Amino acid sequence: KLLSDPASVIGPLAQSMITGLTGALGNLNTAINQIGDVLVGTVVTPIN
Amino acid sequence: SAISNVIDWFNSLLNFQDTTTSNQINQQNFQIATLASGIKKQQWECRYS
């Protein structure tokens, strides 16, 4: 069951357990926030 | 907050857009009117304006 369908057997787990998931989400959210902020000013260091 | 800031910036850009278009139309019409009107011959130089 763990090989085929790991849904029922494995319970809910925190995003922080996944490697780099929180980092990617934070990067995307910060990019969106910077996109919003630049249009009104508040000069900030660009992400990429 | 980012989407709200984008909304505000877009509204500001639209305001600038309409103001600039209105100013362009007004300036061109004013120049055309000034060119059309202007100096007219006095009464003694000729009868007609």
The owner of tokens 């660009």 is: A46
Question: Resolution in A for the shown PDB structure?
Answer: 4.3
Work out whether the CA dihedral B19, B24, B29, B30 comes out positive or negative.
Answer: positive
* Cα(B44)–Cα(A24) distance, integer angstroms: 86
8 Å CB contact between A40 and B8: yes
CA of A3 vs chain B CAs: smallest distance (Å): 42
Which residue numbers in chain A precede an interruption (C–N > 2.5 Å)? none
B38 backbone dihedrals φ, ψ, rounded to 5°: 135, -140
Residue of B nearest to A33 (CA): B2
* Cα(B8)–Cα(A41) distance, integer angstroms: 12
CA of B25 vs chain A CAs: smallest distance (Å): 28
Chain B residues with CB within 8 Å of chain A CB: 1-6, 8-9
Residue A31 sits at the vertex; the CA angle it makes with A15 and B1, to the nearest 5 degrees, is 95
CB within 8 A of A2, min separation 6: which ones? A9, A10
8 Å CB contact between A35 and B5: no
Q: How was this structure determined?
A: cryo-EM
DSSP B19: H
User: Given an 8 Å threshold on Cβ–Cβ distance, is A37 in contact with B4?
Assistant: no
